[PDB]
Design a protein around this ligand. Structure first.
Ligand code: NAP
Ligand code: ZST
Length: 315
């Protein structure tokens, strides 16, 4: 089955296309190809600074009558510099304008940390610390709720929230919408068992990002572990006559997760979608979960003093 039921009654495709680090010079082509081979879910963000070019590709394929808007599941995220309640609608509408859409299927608080408002996306002080804003999770969530009620977005959720942060929202007195999705890093080196169990037990759908271990993350170090190059995973893949990437994508699908692998290479975009024709065994699943090492590609150290830094907590 290709989609998962959200708590707003909408269905979300469990396989989507990631766009972080896709240059504007290629994401337009990536999205056109992805739509052509079956992708219906695109994961976007203002901070990826390519939303216009994603937009160009969606609009053209609608025009080309390849797909209808209702068939598409378009996701974007509120960046940290816009957590002030007065700044949220504006940030959402900028994304909508860039994407040439009149609604988003899902809009996420990108990170639980608010940053000092301004032009700069990562404001740092003279000594390299991120400059926080005096905003809090709940007031930001309230502002996300207004976007639903104004029809700009069909569902709202969070990303990179620990279970206590998620709980803050669930337990909010006067809560209008429960989060639909929590999008978190997840792969065989960071298996997220406790956070996944929590979220699923609250009927919050989990999206796994960086499922291939983000080998193009800009701060990669040669000594870092490399999922696509792990000979153990390569061995599972060889056994199924699939690539290592296909195995890494299928793995979260069998944990009832949504997964959003990124590529701008047309051959890989196609390859990555071809994962509904095979099953990983119970042993394969057990084996892949045993590789957990609590290793994160996304965890900017200049943020570790923010009051809302999410990764001090065990989960
Ligand atoms: N919520 C958040 O905080 C957050 C954080 C990080 C990521 N995400 C989202 O999750 C998406 C996926 O994560 P990610 O971009 O970090 O990394 P990823 O999807 O784990 O890996 C993308 C890297 O894998 C390569 N790749 C893709 N398919 C391949 C294949 N079949 N064989 C070999 N290499 C392949 C890509 O190369 P080419 O593109 O050059 O083909 C690129 O270098 C992002 O794009 C973004 O949409 C969200
Ligand atoms: O954001 C993307 O989608 C990918 C992403 N991840 N990271 C690593 C980060 N680590 C963080 C940690 C916190 C923290 F909450 F923990 F404080 C807050 C914010 C961040 S950004 C980046 O630095 C980044 C820069 C530009 C575009 C995308 C990204």
């Amino acid at each position: 089955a290709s989609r998962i039921l959200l708590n707003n009654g909408a269905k979300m495709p469990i396989l989507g296309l990631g766009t972080w680090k896709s240059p504007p010079g290629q994401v337009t082509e990536a999205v056109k190809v992805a739509i052509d081979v079956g992708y219906r879910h695109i994961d976007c963000a203002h901070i990826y600074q390519n939303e216009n070019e994603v937009g160009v590709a969606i609009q053209e394929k609608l025009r080309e009558q390849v797909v209808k808007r209702e068939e598409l599941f378009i996701v974007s995220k509120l960046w940290c510099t816009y957590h002030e309640k007065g700044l949220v609608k504006g940030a959402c509408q900028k994304t909508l304008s860039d994407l040439k859409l009149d609604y988003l299927d899902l809009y996420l608080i990108h990170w639980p940390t608010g940053f000092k408002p301004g032009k700069e996306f990562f404001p740092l002080d003279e000594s390299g610390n991120v400059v926080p804003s005096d905003t809090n999770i709940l007031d930001t969530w309230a502002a996300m709720e207004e976007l639903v009620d104004e029809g700009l977005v069909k569902a709202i959720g969070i990303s990179n929230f620990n279970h206590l942060q998620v709980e803050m929202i669930l337990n909010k007195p006067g809560l209008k919408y429960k989060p639909a999705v929590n999008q978190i890093e997840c792969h065989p080196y960071l298996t997220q068992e406790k956070l996944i169990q929590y979220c699923q037990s609250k009927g919050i759908v989990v999206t796994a990002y960086s499922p291939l271990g983000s080998p193009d993350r800009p701060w990669a170090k040669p000594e870092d572990p490399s999922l696509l190059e792990d000979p153990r995973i390569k061995a599972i893949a060889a056994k199924h006559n699939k690539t290592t990437a296909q195995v890494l994508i299928r793995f979260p699908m069998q944990r009832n997760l949504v997964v959003i692998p990124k590529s701008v290479t047309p051959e890989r975009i196609a390859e990555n979608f071809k994962v509904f024709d095979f099953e990983l065994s119970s042993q394969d699943m057990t084996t892949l979960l045993s590789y957990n090492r609590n290793w994160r590609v996304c965890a900017l150290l200049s943020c570790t003093s923010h009051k809302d830094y999410p990764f001090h907590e065990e989960f």
